[PDB]
Write a protein that binds this ligand. Structure first.
Ligand SMILES: Cn1cc(C(F)(F)F)nc1[C@H]1CCCNC1
Ligand SMILES: Cn1cc(C(F)(F)F)nc1[C@H]1CCCNC1
Lengths: 197, 197
């Protein structure tokens, strides 16, 4: 047995499992299946840990899974003092993707919602700390005012709402879902199902 | 999109990942790759948690993975007071397999080694507690004597040694390895490697 050619096959299968788990994480996120998302995320992290080295494509995949995990935990709320949406905002800006009108839309919605979710939980000191971390040198003039006067139900927040953020993210998720829908593992699995029907 | 036919495909792929991870756990166990075994075991447990229901074949697979994890931790040495080899002995007796001459050989070696590893760590009280749990109503007359006189280097233990146990287990592992070597995921992965060479 050639240990090298066996490890090479294990690496090909690890990459195949990663793409399938990303696709399952995207669908669970879109479908609102919380427990399924939690279980699939655990499987993806374990598969990723087995891989010693990742390609640029695989890095993009794991970063999407990490971004979705953070968005899923936004209203919850580890190793750092930053909030889950602030953490999603760092991932979002570092994913190797085109910075189109949808990228900026999601980015500003996450920035706004990182503050709004603190205010809605009654954490006004945290909203102030999140604000200074996100804006420390376009909407800063308005947000500082809203946070200062503790106006949780300002009309600005009703336009840039959690649902508005969640819909823009869910439409980004649908593009990733169409791109990876043709990956090896899911395509081979769907073929088996159709053979039984 | 038919949510039912998507979940069906996800279940087919989960079963495919389980067989591949079992095969990778068997090879890592046989190869002495401790860290690889640890990482693959973590991946297998996460995949198993995603599956709501398992077939008899899949139950046999997870039980082999659990048995190997326990054997790997035998000289270490959670939720119970039983030792890892005592736990391997419960799995061994409940795996749906033929009780051949190799089954009884592995069983008696595990029974003997569950006591011997306690004595070798200087845990003579634990060796006595393990003995009464394993024998509480063939070698009991001899083992009680060896444990009573704290004879860690008795010739009985040199015949039924950790290596003797480990070799019989490694030859069982090789039969499982030949049986699952033809599973979908590993066979498809190996085909890709040969296409590149
Ligand atoms: C490394 N990694 C991969 C993933 C996954 F989302 F599953 F893709 N998640 C993590 C880590 C990132 C830091 C916090 N803990 C989890
Ligand atoms: C359920 N399960 C599956 C496996 C695996 F070995 F990965 F196959 N291990 C467990 C559990 C068994 C009880 C102790 N903790 C781990």
């Amino acid at each position: 047995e050639d240990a090298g050619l066996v490890a090479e096959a294990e690496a090909v299968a690890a990459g195949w499992m990663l793409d399938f788990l990303c696709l399952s994480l995207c669908r669970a996120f879109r479908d609102g299946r919380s427990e399924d998302f939690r279980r699939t995320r655990n499987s993806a992290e374990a598969i990723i840990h087995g891989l010693s080295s990742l390609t640029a494509c695989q890095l993009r995949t794991i970063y999407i899974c990490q971004f979705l995990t953070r968005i899923a935990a936004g209203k919850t709320l580890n190793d750092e003092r930053i909030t889950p949406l602030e953490s999603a905002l760092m991932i979002w800006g570092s994913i190797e993707k085109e910075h189109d009108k949808l990228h900026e839309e999601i980015q500003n919605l996450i920035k706004i919602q990182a503050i709004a979710v603190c205010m809605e939980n009654g954490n006004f000191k945290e909203a102030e700390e999140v604000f200074e971390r996100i804006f420390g040198d376009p909407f800063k003039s308005k947000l500082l005012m809203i946070i200062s006067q503790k106006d949780t139900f300002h009309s600005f927040f009703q336009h840039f709402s959690y649902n508005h953020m969640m819909e823009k993210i869910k439409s980004y998720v649908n593009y990733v879902l169409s791109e990876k829908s043709s990956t090896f593992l899911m395509k081979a699995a769907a073929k088996v199902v159709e053979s039984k029907r």
